[PDB]
Coordinates of C-alpha atoms and ligand atoms in Angstrom, one line a residue:
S22 CA 0.1 -0.1 0.0
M23 CA 3.0 2.4 -0.9
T24 CA 6.5 2.4 1.2
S25 CA 6.9 4.9 3.9
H26 CA 9.8 6.4 2.4
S27 CA 12.6 6.1 -0.2
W28 CA 16.3 7.8 -0.8
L29 CA 17.3 10.0 -3.7
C30 CA 20.7 11.4 -4.2
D31 CA 22.5 7.9 -3.5
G32 CA 21.1 7.7 -0.3
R33 CA 21.6 11.2 0.8
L34 CA 18.1 12.7 0.3
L35 CA 15.0 11.5 2.1
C36 CA 11.8 11.1 -0.1
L37 CA 8.6 10.6 2.1
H38 CA 5.6 9.4 0.2
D39 CA 2.4 10.1 1.9
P40 CA 2.3 13.7 2.8
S41 CA -0.4 13.5 5.6
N42 CA 1.2 10.5 7.6
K43 CA 1.1 11.3 11.3
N44 CA 4.4 9.3 11.8
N45 CA 6.6 11.2 9.2
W46 CA 8.1 13.4 12.0
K47 CA 10.1 10.2 13.4
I48 CA 11.8 9.8 9.7
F49 CA 12.3 13.7 9.3
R50 CA 13.7 14.9 12.1
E51 CA 17.1 13.0 12.2
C52 CA 17.7 14.3 8.6
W53 CA 16.6 17.8 9.3
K54 CA 18.8 17.9 12.7
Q55 CA 21.7 17.2 10.1
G56 CA 21.0 20.0 7.8
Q57 CA 19.9 18.0 5.2
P58 CA 16.8 19.0 2.8
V59 CA 13.9 16.5 2.4
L60 CA 11.6 16.0 -0.6
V61 CA 7.8 14.8 0.1
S62 CA 5.8 13.8 -2.9
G63 CA 2.1 13.5 -3.7
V64 CA 1.1 16.6 -2.4
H65 CA -1.2 17.8 -5.5
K66 CA -3.6 14.5 -4.6
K67 CA -4.5 16.6 -1.6
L68 CA -5.3 19.7 -3.5
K69 CA -8.4 21.1 -5.3
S70 CA -6.7 21.1 -8.7
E71 CA -9.2 23.8 -10.2
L72 CA -8.0 26.3 -7.9
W73 CA -4.2 26.0 -9.4
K74 CA -4.8 26.5 -13.0
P75 CA -3.3 29.3 -15.2
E76 CA -6.5 30.1 -16.6
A77 CA -8.5 30.7 -13.7
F78 CA -5.4 33.1 -12.4
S79 CA -5.9 35.0 -15.5
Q80 CA -9.7 35.0 -15.3
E81 CA -10.0 36.4 -11.8
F82 CA -6.7 38.5 -11.3
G83 CA -6.0 39.4 -15.1
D84 CA -6.6 43.2 -15.0
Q85 CA -3.8 43.7 -12.1
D86 CA -0.7 45.6 -12.9
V87 CA 2.6 44.0 -12.2
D88 CA 6.1 43.8 -13.4
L89 CA 8.0 40.8 -15.2
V90 CA 11.7 39.9 -15.5
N91 CA 13.3 38.6 -18.8
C92 CA 15.2 35.7 -17.3
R93 CA 17.9 35.4 -20.1
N94 CA 19.1 39.1 -19.6
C95 CA 17.6 40.2 -16.3
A96 CA 15.6 43.1 -18.1
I97 CA 12.5 44.4 -16.3
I98 CA 9.1 44.6 -18.1
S99 CA 7.1 47.4 -16.3
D100 CA 3.7 48.1 -15.5
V101 CA 1.8 45.5 -17.6
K102 CA -1.3 43.5 -17.1
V103 CA -0.8 40.4 -15.3
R104 CA -3.1 38.6 -18.1
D105 CA -0.3 39.2 -20.5
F106 CA 2.0 36.7 -18.1
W107 CA -0.8 34.2 -17.6
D108 CA -2.0 33.8 -21.2
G109 CA 1.5 32.9 -22.5
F110 CA 2.0 30.4 -19.5
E111 CA 1.5 27.3 -21.9
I112 CA 0.7 28.7 -25.5
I113 CA 4.2 29.8 -26.6
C114 CA 2.6 31.9 -29.9
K115 CA 0.9 34.3 -27.0
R116 CA 4.2 35.1 -25.1
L117 CA 5.7 38.5 -25.2
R118 CA 8.7 39.0 -27.9
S119 CA 12.2 40.4 -27.4
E120 CA 13.6 42.6 -30.2
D121 CA 15.1 39.5 -32.1
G122 CA 11.5 38.4 -32.4
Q123 CA 11.8 35.2 -30.0
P124 CA 9.1 34.6 -27.3
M125 CA 10.7 35.6 -23.9
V126 CA 11.4 33.2 -21.0
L127 CA 9.5 35.6 -18.6
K128 CA 9.3 35.4 -14.6
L129 CA 6.3 37.3 -12.7
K130 CA 7.8 39.1 -10.0
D131 CA 6.4 39.5 -6.4
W132 CA 2.6 38.8 -7.3
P133 CA 0.4 38.5 -5.2
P134 CA 2.6 41.3 -3.9
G135 CA 4.3 41.6 0.1
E136 CA 2.1 39.3 2.6
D137 CA -1.2 39.8 0.4
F138 CA -1.7 36.3 -0.4
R139 CA -4.1 35.6 2.1
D140 CA -6.4 38.6 1.4
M141 CA -6.3 38.2 -2.2
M142 CA -7.1 34.6 -2.4
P143 CA -8.5 33.0 1.0
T144 CA -9.8 29.9 -0.9
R145 CA -6.3 29.0 -2.2
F146 CA -4.8 30.0 1.0
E147 CA -7.0 27.4 3.2
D148 CA -6.5 24.7 0.4
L149 CA -2.6 25.1 0.7
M150 CA -2.2 25.5 4.5
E151 CA -4.4 22.8 5.4
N152 CA -2.6 20.3 3.3
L153 CA 1.1 21.0 4.1
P154 CA 3.4 18.2 5.2
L155 CA 5.0 18.2 8.9
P156 CA 2.1 20.4 9.9
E157 CA 3.8 20.9 13.6
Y158 CA 6.8 22.6 11.6
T159 CA 5.2 24.3 8.7
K160 CA 1.6 25.8 10.3
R161 CA 1.8 29.3 11.4
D162 CA 0.7 28.1 14.9
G163 CA 2.5 24.5 14.8
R164 CA 3.9 23.3 17.6
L165 CA 7.8 23.1 16.3
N166 CA 7.3 26.7 14.6
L167 CA 8.8 29.3 16.6
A168 CA 8.1 32.0 14.3
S169 CA 5.4 33.4 16.4
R170 CA 7.1 32.6 20.0
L171 CA 10.6 34.6 19.2
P172 CA 11.7 38.0 20.5
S173 CA 13.4 40.7 18.6
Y174 CA 16.8 39.3 19.0
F175 CA 15.4 37.0 16.3
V176 CA 14.6 37.8 12.4
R177 CA 11.1 36.5 12.0
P178 CA 9.8 35.5 8.6
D179 CA 7.2 37.8 6.9
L180 CA 3.5 36.5 7.0
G181 CA 3.4 34.0 3.7
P182 CA 2.5 32.0 1.8
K183 CA 4.4 33.5 -1.6
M184 CA 3.7 32.3 -5.1
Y185 CA 6.5 31.6 -7.5
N186 CA 5.4 32.0 -11.4
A187 CA 7.7 31.6 -14.1
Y188 CA 8.1 30.0 -17.8
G189 CA 10.4 27.0 -18.5
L190 CA 14.1 27.8 -19.7
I191 CA 14.0 26.3 -23.2
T192 CA 17.6 26.4 -25.3
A193 CA 21.0 24.9 -25.0
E194 CA 22.0 28.5 -24.1
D195 CA 19.4 28.5 -21.5
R196 CA 21.2 25.7 -19.7
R197 CA 23.4 28.2 -18.0
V198 CA 20.5 30.7 -16.7
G199 CA 18.5 30.6 -13.5
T200 CA 14.9 31.0 -12.9
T201 CA 16.0 32.0 -9.2
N202 CA 20.0 32.7 -8.8
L203 CA 22.1 31.4 -5.7
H204 CA 21.1 32.8 -2.4
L205 CA 20.1 31.7 1.3
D206 CA 17.2 32.5 3.5
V207 CA 17.7 32.9 7.6
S208 CA 14.3 31.1 7.8
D209 CA 13.5 27.4 6.9
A210 CA 11.2 27.2 4.0
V211 CA 8.7 24.4 2.4
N212 CA 8.4 24.9 -1.4
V213 CA 5.4 22.8 -3.3
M214 CA 4.9 22.5 -6.8
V215 CA 1.0 23.0 -7.4
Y216 CA 1.1 23.4 -11.3
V217 CA 3.2 22.0 -14.3
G218 CA 2.6 23.3 -17.7
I219 CA 4.1 21.7 -20.7
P220 CA 3.6 23.9 -23.8
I221 CA 2.2 23.5 -27.5
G222 CA 3.3 25.5 -30.6
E223 CA 7.1 24.8 -30.0
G224 CA 6.4 21.4 -28.1
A225 CA 8.3 18.3 -29.1
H226 CA 10.8 20.2 -26.7
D227 CA 11.2 16.8 -24.5
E228 CA 15.2 16.4 -25.4
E229 CA 16.9 19.6 -24.3
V230 CA 15.0 18.9 -20.9
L231 CA 16.5 15.3 -20.5
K232 CA 20.2 16.7 -21.3
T233 CA 19.7 19.3 -18.8
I234 CA 18.8 16.9 -16.0
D235 CA 21.6 14.7 -16.8
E236 CA 24.5 17.6 -17.0
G237 CA 22.7 18.9 -13.8
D238 CA 24.2 15.8 -11.9
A239 CA 20.7 14.3 -11.1
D240 CA 20.7 10.6 -9.7
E241 CA 19.7 7.5 -11.4
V242 CA 16.7 6.9 -9.6
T243 CA 15.3 10.4 -10.1
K244 CA 15.8 9.8 -14.2
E245 CA 13.5 6.5 -14.0
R246 CA 10.5 8.8 -12.3
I247 CA 10.2 10.4 -15.7
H248 CA 11.1 7.1 -18.2
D249 CA 9.0 4.7 -15.8
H250 CA 6.2 6.7 -14.0
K251 CA 5.7 9.6 -16.5
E252 CA 5.6 12.2 -13.8
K253 CA 5.5 15.9 -14.9
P254 CA 9.0 17.6 -13.7
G255 CA 8.9 21.3 -13.0
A256 CA 12.2 22.4 -11.9
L257 CA 16.0 21.5 -11.2
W258 CA 17.1 22.8 -7.8
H259 CA 20.9 22.6 -6.5
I260 CA 20.9 23.0 -2.6
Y261 CA 24.4 23.6 -0.4
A262 CA 24.6 22.8 3.3
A263 CA 24.6 25.9 5.3
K264 CA 28.0 25.0 6.8
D265 CA 29.5 25.5 3.2
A266 CA 28.2 28.9 2.3
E267 CA 31.7 30.6 2.8
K268 CA 33.5 28.4 1.0
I269 CA 31.1 29.1 -2.0
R270 CA 31.5 33.0 -1.3
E271 CA 35.3 32.4 -2.0
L272 CA 34.9 30.6 -4.9
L273 CA 32.3 33.5 -6.4
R274 CA 34.7 36.2 -5.3
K275 CA 37.7 34.5 -7.2
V276 CA 35.8 34.1 -10.4
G277 CA 34.2 37.7 -10.2
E278 CA 37.8 38.6 -10.1
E279 CA 38.6 36.3 -13.2
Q280 CA 35.7 38.0 -15.2
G281 CA 37.0 41.8 -14.3
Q282 CA 34.6 42.5 -11.6
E283 CA 36.0 44.9 -9.1
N284 CA 34.7 44.0 -5.7
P285 CA 35.9 44.6 -2.0
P286 CA 37.5 41.3 -0.6
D287 CA 34.6 41.2 2.2
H288 CA 31.7 41.5 -0.3
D289 CA 29.0 39.0 -0.4
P290 CA 28.3 37.2 -4.0
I291 CA 25.7 34.9 -2.2
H292 CA 23.2 38.0 -0.6
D293 CA 23.7 40.0 -4.1
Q294 CA 21.5 37.2 -5.7
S295 CA 23.6 37.7 -8.9
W296 CA 25.0 34.0 -9.6
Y297 CA 23.9 30.8 -11.4
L298 CA 26.1 27.5 -10.9
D299 CA 26.4 26.1 -14.4
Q300 CA 27.9 22.8 -15.0
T301 CA 31.7 24.4 -15.3
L302 CA 31.2 26.3 -11.6
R303 CA 29.4 23.4 -9.8
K304 CA 32.6 21.1 -11.0
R305 CA 35.2 23.7 -9.8
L306 CA 33.1 24.0 -6.5
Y307 CA 33.4 20.3 -6.0
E308 CA 37.3 19.9 -7.4
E309 CA 38.7 23.1 -6.0
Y310 CA 36.8 23.7 -2.6
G311 CA 35.8 19.8 -1.6
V312 CA 32.2 21.0 -1.7
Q313 CA 29.0 18.6 -2.6
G314 CA 25.3 19.9 -3.3
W315 CA 21.9 18.0 -3.8
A316 CA 20.8 17.9 -7.3
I317 CA 16.7 17.7 -6.8
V318 CA 14.2 17.5 -9.5
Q319 CA 10.8 19.0 -8.2
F320 CA 8.0 17.2 -9.9
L321 CA 4.2 18.2 -9.8
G322 CA 3.2 17.9 -6.0
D323 CA 6.6 17.6 -4.6
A324 CA 7.4 19.9 -1.6
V325 CA 11.1 20.7 -1.1
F326 CA 12.1 21.4 2.5
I327 CA 15.3 23.7 2.5
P328 CA 17.2 24.0 5.8
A329 CA 17.6 27.8 7.0
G330 CA 21.1 29.2 5.9
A331 CA 21.5 26.8 2.9
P332 CA 22.5 28.2 -0.2
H333 CA 20.0 27.5 -3.3
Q334 CA 19.2 28.1 -6.9
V335 CA 16.3 27.1 -9.0
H336 CA 15.9 26.5 -12.9
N337 CA 12.4 25.7 -14.5
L338 CA 12.6 23.0 -16.8
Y339 CA 8.6 23.9 -17.7
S340 CA 6.3 26.5 -16.9
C341 CA 5.9 26.2 -13.0
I342 CA 3.5 27.5 -10.1
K343 CA 5.4 27.0 -6.7
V344 CA 3.7 28.2 -3.4
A345 CA 6.3 28.5 -0.3
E346 CA 5.7 29.1 3.4
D347 CA 8.7 30.1 5.8
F348 CA 8.8 28.6 9.5
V349 CA 11.3 28.7 12.0
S350 CA 12.3 25.1 13.4
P351 CA 14.0 24.7 16.8
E352 CA 16.6 22.7 15.0
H353 CA 18.0 25.6 12.8
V354 CA 16.9 28.8 14.9
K355 CA 20.4 29.9 15.5
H356 CA 20.7 31.0 11.8
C357 CA 18.3 33.9 12.6
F358 CA 19.7 35.3 15.8
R359 CA 21.2 38.9 15.7
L360 CA 24.4 38.6 17.6
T361 CA 27.3 36.6 17.9
Ligands
LIG1 C1 -2.6 6.3 3.8 C2 -1.2 5.6 3.5 O1 -1.3 4.3 4.0 C3 -0.2 3.5 4.5 O2 -0.5 2.1 4.1 C4 1.1 4.0 5.1 C5 2.0 4.6 3.6 C6 2.8 5.4 4.7 N1 3.7 4.8 5.7 C7 4.0 5.8 6.6 C8 4.3 5.2 7.8 N2 5.0 5.8 8.9 C9 5.6 7.1 8.7 C10 5.3 7.6 7.2 N3 4.5 7.0 6.3 C11 3.4 3.3 5.8 C12 1.6 2.8 5.6
LIG2 CL1 22.3 24.3 10.8
LIG3 CL1 -9.3 32.4 -3.4
LIG4 CL1 4.7 17.4 12.0
LIG5 CL1 17.1 35.8 -8.9
LIG6 MN1 14.8 30.9 -1.0

């Protein structure tokens, strides 16, 4: 009747199979205490699938004004209607075009804005918050979430959740670009893939996706989820242990200098959110600094748990809708303390 869990990343990543199992914490807490990320599959089967479609967001919210980002060159597209984003999510012939006349790979910036998700989308808020895995950690009032219980000596997360909406990266050149560049968060996070859109028009794009996963260092069991079970892959993540953050900063200072950037010796390339670690940079991190990460493919309905302090980057394989909630576990509270 389905096994409790399996392993990815050759034994280094816990994958829980039943999102609402009351005994998940017993397997989870040992991996979490060691500063590892955790994957939980099957959250899509708990949700009302009609609430998470791109066509519904366009119909209900299409007249709101927003900014977009061109993922290929970081150009900002200012003050457009949110339908201009949603109507091109899966239909390539409807996307905003760059000067070269190609359809753009776009990210929708800060939408819903700030802490407004609950007010703007109360039925979505309920559906997500009631079906989050590890609820004693992840609910606003969970017994193991210290977010509402800490004094001002700790950086507290904003009221969530936050939605992350972007097209898939397409070409061989796109393999070196991030959807979200390398950064870290002082809080813990759970990120849920609630919808994956595989386009039509330039549909037949299956093969660059396989080369991206393979070159991305994905394990053999992860490759079997496509070929054997035909699940929809959304996004390729690289996550690094919080303890390796300074070694990553040293690599990126050296590369910034090799590329003729002019940066003070103390500047923080992870906080700048300006780098994506491509195959060349990931190999250099392993070979020159001794640092190994976790390469994670987030499929429809996968919840990725990212530990406080852990540097991480995201590369969309197809068009994705992700919803994330921040929390403060007792295992990782040291990462948000304002002294020493
Ligand atoms: C509704 C799921 O049905 C089952 O029979 C479960 C499947 C998942 N599992 C556990 C057990 N402990 C912790 C976490 N998961 C084993 C039994
Ligand atoms: Cl830690
Ligand atoms: Cl709603
Ligand atoms: Cl729990
Ligand atoms: Cl970014
Ligand atoms: Mn993050």
